Amino acid sequence: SALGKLQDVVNQNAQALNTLVKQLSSNFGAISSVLNDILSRLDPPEAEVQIDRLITGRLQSLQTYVTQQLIRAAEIRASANLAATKMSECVLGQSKRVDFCGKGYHLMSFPQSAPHGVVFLHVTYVPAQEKNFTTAPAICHDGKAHFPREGVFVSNGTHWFVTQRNFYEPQIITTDNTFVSGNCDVVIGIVNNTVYDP
Amino acid sequence: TRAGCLIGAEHVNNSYECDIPIGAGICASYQTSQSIIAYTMSLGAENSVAYSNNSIAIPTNFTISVTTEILPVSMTKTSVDCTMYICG
Amino acid sequence: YTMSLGAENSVAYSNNSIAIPTNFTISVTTEILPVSMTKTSVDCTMYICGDSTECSNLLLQYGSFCTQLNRALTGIAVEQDKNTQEVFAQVKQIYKTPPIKDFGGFNFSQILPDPSKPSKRSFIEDLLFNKVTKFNGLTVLPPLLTDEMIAQYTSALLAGTITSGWTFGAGAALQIPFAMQMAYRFNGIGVTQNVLYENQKLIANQFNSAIGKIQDSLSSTASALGKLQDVVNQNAQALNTLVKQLSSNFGAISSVLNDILSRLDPPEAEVQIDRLITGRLQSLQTYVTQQLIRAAEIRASANLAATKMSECVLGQSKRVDFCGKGYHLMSFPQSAPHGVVFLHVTYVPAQEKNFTTAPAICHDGKAHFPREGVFVSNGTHWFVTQRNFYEPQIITTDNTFVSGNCDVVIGIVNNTVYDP
Amino acid sequence: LTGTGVLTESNKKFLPFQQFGRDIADTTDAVRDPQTLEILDITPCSFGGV
Ligand SMILES: *[C@@H]1O[C@H](CO)[C@@H](O)[C@H](O)[C@H]1NC(C)=O
Ligand SMILES: *[C@@H]1O[C@H](CO)[C@@H](O)[C@H](O)[C@H]1NC(C)=O
Ligand SMILES: *[C@@H]1O[C@H](CO)[C@@H](O)[C@H](O)[C@H]1NC(C)=O
Ligand SMILES: *[C@@H]1O[C@H](CO)[C@@H](O)[C@H](O)[C@H]1NC(C)=O
Ligand SMILES: *[C@@H]1O[C@H](CO)[C@@H](O)[C@H](O)[C@H]1NC(C)=O
Ligand SMILES: *[C@@H]1O[C@H](CO)[C@@H](O)[C@H](O)[C@H]1NC(C)=O
Ligand SMILES: *[C@@H]1O[C@H](CO)[C@@H](O)[C@H](O)[C@H]1NC(C)=O
Ligand SMILES: *[C@@H]1O[C@H](CO)[C@@H](O)[C@H](O)[C@H]1NC(C)=O
Ligand SMILES: *[C@@H]1O[C@H](CO)[C@@H](O)[C@H](O)[C@H]1NC(C)=O
Ligand SMILES: *[C@@H]1O[C@H](CO)[C@@H](O)[C@H](O)[C@H]1NC(C)=O
Ligand SMILES: *[C@@H]1O[C@H](CO)[C@@H](O)[C@H](O)[C@H]1NC(C)=O
């Protein structure tokens, strides 16, 4: 049941073809549904009246089939354009669009062929094993605010560290991962702590 | 129901996923002595984030997951001659 | 009159002049997108003849046309259900907002559901739903999800976006203070976090004022929700035309089939019933074709809404003019009749001043290029702002890097580089 | 006028010269009894989908 989208198109096309074929078993108000019978049982002056109704019916059926086929080909073209954009933005390069090439942080996609379709193997990065940590926007060492450069200030309860935003890697808060900007009485939520100078 | 009268199913006071769509918030499923049950579909679990002004959660591990995305590309190319369908 | 394309502005361009904004305004826009149509089914046997048998026998000679129309309408209904299932159900666990609402100063009480109503919608959603407010064979099928379920989905998405940021659409939702979330989203457009951690009060005031202005605009002006009313008007007009097509004669002696079956004999009534059958069948086929063509555009709009729900609310987008006019910060989803309404919070710079700039500076024969910044001047002294917010810093060897000599770069200027 | 549907007493303000009644869909929903001067509402017979 996984390859359902690819099978639905085939089923719709088969149903359309079968209906177009079965539309030839109708008389549309005539005496028969076979032109051979009408032509071998009636004279040309009187058989055209019966042939015109079949012609009108079959023409209407064929026009309906062509209209439905164009409407379906529009959706198929939209899906093909989406698949091409995905192939260009996730197989030939890493993407940053959320929920565009899988759930999680996109890493790489692998193209795989399929009957009248394409299957993408989206390798994603899903974080796990969360853990609670108390945090502060910055710190006050000598009356100045030390905002982090790339990370977040966390504390295990007693000591303050600086780690990443997607993976817990505690490091000593030094003046190489934090920048000083402004005083220490304008930011709400700041916590006093020491900054190590190598 | 808000979509009509369902004759043949039993209305349970539980909430499960949607198997057979019926109408406005009503779904059907063949679950337990077996019978068809009608119920109100559930949108999901009721989680509650421990939000505060001085707490943050940082993941310590990770998991690489590979999912599949199936997209149709083309259809069967067909050609219908009118002189063989309307006539012949 | 001849329409005007706008004002005639003239950017004062020069090889040694740059404009760096000194302030900012938090704007909140509104984008409305139609997501679903009205699920309608048409019994062709009841619409073409009506409680009759001879006309049904005459119509059975036309093949599998009513089956085709019913299949097309059922596919349209399933597509409309998929259109609203793939937009509001991008979350597995229904999140809830904490009781204590302390988000740094951002007031979400007017965007979050209120206990006043039976835990159904919010003030903005109530305005949206109050602003866009059994037949001869036609029937309207109700949608799978109800207004309450779509509203609960939007509330869960909002709670997740407020209490976790973008960590609830990429795995497990982890808690984070809203101030640090706003700082991290400011660090994604070019501005540093020290600007937010010092103008948080002004930012919260501007956000509250923008939400109030959005509410006022929704209350006073009712012409905003036009894309949602247009679809309803088109569907109603299509249904009205399909109903009024039952009054035409199409060459027959009467539009009512009972008046024909009670006046003529079966030998002569078939000729008068065939005209009505053909006319009503052509009308119904035209209606179905137009409905499919309209459902195509509605599916396109629903896919656009799913895209603006995935990488716009469950993450910050860097696509220009895709999630608001300006630097996107955060978007908020709101339920609407047959549609979705986004509230795009965008960073808009303002109050820019004119400074003189240089590509690099030469200190000891070697060139110094900024790591992340632009060299500016107040007239006599050289500084460096970040990219968009004027924060003059002393040019040290920690915010610049040396690359070659200053004899190949056009625009070099002699200046002192501070060594700590 | 021949057809089918439930007949019920209507509260419409028929005029002394009006005999029939049509809605916005050009459908007869009210008639006057040719014997008793009473207006009856013609509501369609019950139907739906299965
Ligand atoms: C964080 O705290 C909340 C509330 O006590 C708790 O439900 C959650 O499990 C904690 N997370 C972890 C894994 O520390
Ligand atoms: C916090 O971390 C420090 C350094 O790793 C350690 O010495 C201390 O025991 C930890 N405290 C707690 C409460 O875990
Ligand atoms: C955080 O919230 C608690 C409870 O409302 C409050 O007592 C505390 O002062 C707050 N801290 C800051 C600085 O936001
Ligand atoms: C930080 O230190 C200053 C000066 O000692 C003091 O006034 C302030 O209360 C301290 N704040 C905290 C978070 O302890
Ligand atoms: C992360 O998970 C793997 C197995 O999934 C385990 O071997 C490893 O110890 C975990 N990391 C930590 C820090 O516990
Ligand atoms: C920035 O603009 C706001 C009004 O939006 C004003 O209140 C504030 O004083 C301005 N600040 C600066 C730096 O001019
Ligand atoms: C938020 O605004 C509403 C009015 O829209 C007000 O009643 C409420 O007290 C405000 N809440 C805060 C956080 O000030
Ligand atoms: C430029 O800035 C320096 C340092 O703030 C100041 O001493 C000097 O007067 C300023 N000059 C002008 C023209 O503003
Ligand atoms: C900048 O433009 C002016 C005016 O054309 C010119 O005189 C000057 O030499 C130019 N300087 C540079 C950086 O080439
Ligand atoms: C910069 O200084 C060098 C000598 O140190 C000199 O040759 C050059 O002309 C100066 N350039 C400017 C911008 O005056
Ligand atoms: C028809 O005759 C009946 C019985 O006498 C009488 O009740 C009724 O009013 C008459 N109706 C008309 C239209 O004359």
Side-chain angles (χ1 to χ4, degrees), chain A residues 1-102 104-149 151-198, chain B residues 1 3-16 18-88, chain C residues 1-53 55-91 93-99 101 103-119 121-324 326-371 373-420, chain D residues 1-8 10-37 39-50:
Chain A
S1 60
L3 294 164
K5 301 182 61 179
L6 300 183
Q7 190 68 20
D8 289 330
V9 181
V10 182
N11 295 330
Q12 290 173 167
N13 297 330
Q15 290 181 0
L17 289 178
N18 286 273
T19 309
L20 190 66
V21 171
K22 290 184 284 80
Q23 282 294 147
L24 294 180
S25 60
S26 303
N27 54 330
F28 303 102
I31 60 180
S32 297
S33 60
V34 181
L35 297 172
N36 298 330
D37 178 62
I38 303 182
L39 290 178
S40 179
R41 87 196 309 266
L42 287 181
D43 49 322
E46 200 70 20
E48 55 180 0
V49 184
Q50 307 295 337
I51 292 180
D52 292 330
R53 310 193 67 176
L54 287 178
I55 289 183
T56 303
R58 296 175 181 180
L59 226 178
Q60 292 180 1
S61 64
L62 195 53
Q63 289 181 176
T64 304
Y65 169 78
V66 171
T67 303
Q68 295 180 0
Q69 202 70 16
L70 290 169
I71 297 177
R72 207 181 319 274
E75 182 180 1
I76 291 299
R77 182 197 309 168
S79 180
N81 295 330
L82 180 61
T85 54
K86 291 187 181 299
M87 182 79 66
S88 300
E89 297 182 3
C90 299
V91 182
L92 281 70
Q94 188 179 13
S95 179
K96 281 77 181 60
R97 305 174 60 179
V98 183
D99 299 330
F100 180 73
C101 281
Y105 298 151
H106 172 62
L107 293 178
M108 55 185 179
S109 294
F110 297 147
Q112 297 299 324
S113 62
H116 295 348
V118 57
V119 177
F120 303 95
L121 301 183
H122 297 294
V123 182
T124 58
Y125 180 89
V126 180
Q129 297 184 4
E130 305 291 338
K131 186 175 180 300
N132 300 343
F133 289 100
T134 171
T135 177
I139 49 184
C140 303
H141 183 19
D142 300 326
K144 300 179 300 180
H146 303 253
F147 304 96
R149 284 186 169 94
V152 52
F153 283 156
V154 299
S155 179
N156 66 345
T158 58
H159 299 67
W160 288 87
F161 302 96
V162 42
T163 182
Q164 309 174 15
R165 304 174 183 177
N166 299 326
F167 188 85
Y168 179 67
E169 185 179 0
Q171 296 181 358
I172 303 300
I173 303 180
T174 67
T175 168
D176 298 76
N177 57 269
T178 56
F179 66 95
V180 181
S181 296
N183 43 78
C184 242
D185 54 318
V186 70
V187 45
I188 300 299
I190 194 149
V191 178
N192 299 350
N193 192 81
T194 61
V195 181
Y196 176 79
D197 179 70
Chain B
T1 63
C5 305
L6 184 57
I7 313 300
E10 48 181 359
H11 181 214
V12 298
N13 296 329
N14 299 90
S15 299
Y16 312 97
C18 196
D19 300 70
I20 301 178
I22 294 182
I26 301 300
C27 299
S29 182
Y30 191 78
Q31 299 179 181
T32 302
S33 180
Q34 305 290 152
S35 60
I36 302 180
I37 56 179
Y39 53 88
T40 299
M41 56 181 301
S42 60
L43 307 183
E46 296 291 338
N47 185 20
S48 180
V49 183
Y51 174 83
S52 68
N53 49 349
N54 58 90
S55 60
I56 187 184
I58 298 299
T60 60
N61 224 324
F62 51 87
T63 300
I64 280 78
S65 61
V66 189
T67 59
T68 61
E69 190 171 21
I70 311 170
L71 296 180
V73 178
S74 60
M75 63 169 58
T76 59
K77 305 186 303 179
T78 59
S79 59
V80 186
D81 180 67
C82 81
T83 60
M84 291 298 300
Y85 185 83
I86 315 178
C87 295
Chain C
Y1 57 93
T2 299
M3 57 180 300
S4 61
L5 306 183
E8 299 291 338
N9 188 87
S10 180
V11 183
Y13 180 85
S14 180
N15 48 351
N16 54 90
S17 70
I18 196 177
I20 300 299
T22 61
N23 208 359
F24 51 90
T25 168
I26 297 299
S27 300
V28 173
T29 60
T30 294
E31 188 177 10
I32 311 174
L33 297 86
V35 185
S36 61
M37 299 175 59
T38 60
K39 303 169 59 180
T40 59
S41 180
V42 180
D43 188 10
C44 358
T45 308
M46 228 291 182
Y47 176 84
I48 297 179
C49 307
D51 299 327
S52 181
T53 59
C55 175
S56 300
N57 298 330
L58 265 54
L59 182 63
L60 288 180
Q61 299 179 357
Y62 287 86
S64 300
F65 284 160
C66 185
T67 62
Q68 276 185 317
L69 302 180
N70 297 331
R71 183 182 298 102
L73 296 181
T74 305
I76 290 181
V78 175
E79 171 184 337
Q80 298 306 322
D81 295 328
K82 164 185 170 299
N83 286 11
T84 179
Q85 189 68 19
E86 293 185 347
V87 170
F88 298 98
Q90 300 183 2
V91 55
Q93 299 180 356
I94 298 300
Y95 300 103
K96 300 173 58 181
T97 170
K101 299 183 181 302
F103 307 105
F106 294 84
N107 196 357
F108 296 106
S109 63
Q110 49 189 172
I111 198 179
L112 286 173
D114 55 79
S116 300
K117 293 186 296 298
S119 67
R121 289 125 53 179
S122 60
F123 190 81
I124 298 181
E125 298 179 2
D126 179 70
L127 296 180
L128 294 176
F129 274 88
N130 297 332
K131 212 62 56 56
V132 209
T133 60
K134 300 180 300 300
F135 225 161
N136 300 90
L138 315 183
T139 174
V140 180
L141 301 180
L144 180 59
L145 296 180
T146 61
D147 299 0
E148 293 78 10
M149 295 181 175
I150 300 180
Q152 290 183 4
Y153 271 146
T154 56
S155 179
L157 291 174
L158 202 64
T161 311
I162 291 179
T163 60
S164 60
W166 50 56
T167 61
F168 73 101
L174 48 91
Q175 60 275 6
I176 173 179
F178 194 81
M180 302 206 314
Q181 173 185 345
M182 290 300 300
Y184 302 155
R185 301 205 179 198
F186 268 67
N187 286 122
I189 61 181
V191 195
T192 55
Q193 53 188 0
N194 64 268
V195 181
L196 183 111
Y197 289 147
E198 295 178 0
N199 304 272
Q200 183 180 4
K201 300 300 178 299
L202 180 61
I203 292 178
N205 296 332
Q206 289 179 327
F207 177 79
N208 300 333
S209 300
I211 298 298
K213 288 190 296 295
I214 290 300
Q215 284 194 161
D216 295 331
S217 179
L218 290 179
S219 300
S220 60
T221 61
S223 59
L225 294 139
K227 298 303 287 82
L228 299 183
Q229 186 67 22
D230 179 70
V231 181
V232 181
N233 294 334
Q234 290 180 179
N235 298 331
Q237 187 174 190
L239 290 178
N240 292 332
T241 53
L242 189 63
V243 172
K244 265 74 257 179
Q245 283 293 149
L246 293 179
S247 180
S248 176
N249 301 20
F250 302 102
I253 62 179
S254 179
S255 179
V256 182
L257 275 71
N258 299 330
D259 184 71
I260 302 180
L261 294 177
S262 297
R263 283 172 51 183
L264 293 178
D265 51 324
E268 302 292 337
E270 171 260 8
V271 189
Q272 305 294 335
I273 293 180
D274 291 332
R275 271 80 133 274
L276 293 175
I277 287 183
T278 53
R280 297 178 182 184
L281 185 59
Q282 182 178 0
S283 301
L284 199 48
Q285 289 180 0
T286 304
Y287 171 79
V288 170
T289 301
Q290 295 180 358
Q291 211 74 7
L292 289 168
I293 295 179
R294 190 176 306 167
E297 182 180 0
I298 294 298
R299 188 201 305 104
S301 180
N303 297 329
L304 183 60
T307 303
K308 296 182 180 299
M309 184 72 66
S310 299
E311 55 170 328
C312 192
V313 182
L314 280 63
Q316 187 177 12
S317 60
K318 281 77 181 60
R319 305 171 63 181
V320 184
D321 292 332
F322 185 79
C323 281
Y327 301 96
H328 177 68
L329 292 178
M330 54 184 180
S331 181
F332 304 113
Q334 297 300 298
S335 62
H338 293 348
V340 62
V341 171
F342 298 97
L343 301 184
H344 305 286
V345 178
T346 58
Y347 182 90
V348 178
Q351 300 183 190
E352 63 282 351
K353 301 205 307 298
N354 300 332
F355 307 95
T356 169
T357 177
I361 58 176
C362 205
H363 177 47
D364 291 351
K366 50 188 182 298
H368 297 253
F369 305 90
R371 300 181 184 269
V374 34
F375 290 150
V376 297
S377 304
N378 69 341
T380 53
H381 296 67
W382 286 86
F383 303 98
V384 42
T385 167
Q386 315 159 349
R387 191 110 304 178
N388 300 316
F389 192 82
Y390 183 72
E391 185 177 358
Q393 300 290 343
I394 301 180
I395 302 179
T396 60
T397 188
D398 301 330
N399 47 327
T400 188
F401 60 93
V402 178
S403 298
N405 56 89
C406 62
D407 292 321
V408 73
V409 45
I410 301 300
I412 194 73
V413 55
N414 294 344
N415 190 82
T416 305
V417 178
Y418 188 81
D419 181 66
Chain D
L1 175 66
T2 168
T4 175
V6 188
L7 300 182
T8 176
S10 60
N11 58 90
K12 295 184 178 181
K13 310 302 174 57
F14 263 66
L15 298 181
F17 61 92
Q18 298 168 335
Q19 303 294 337
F20 296 151
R22 290 183 170 91
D23 297 4
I24 82 284
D26 299 330
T27 59
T28 305
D29 287 69
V31 291
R32 172 169 294 183
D33 196 313
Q35 297 186 185
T36 60
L37 301 184
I39 300 94
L40 294 318
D41 179 73
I42 300 184
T43 165
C45 201
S46 300
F47 75 102
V50 176

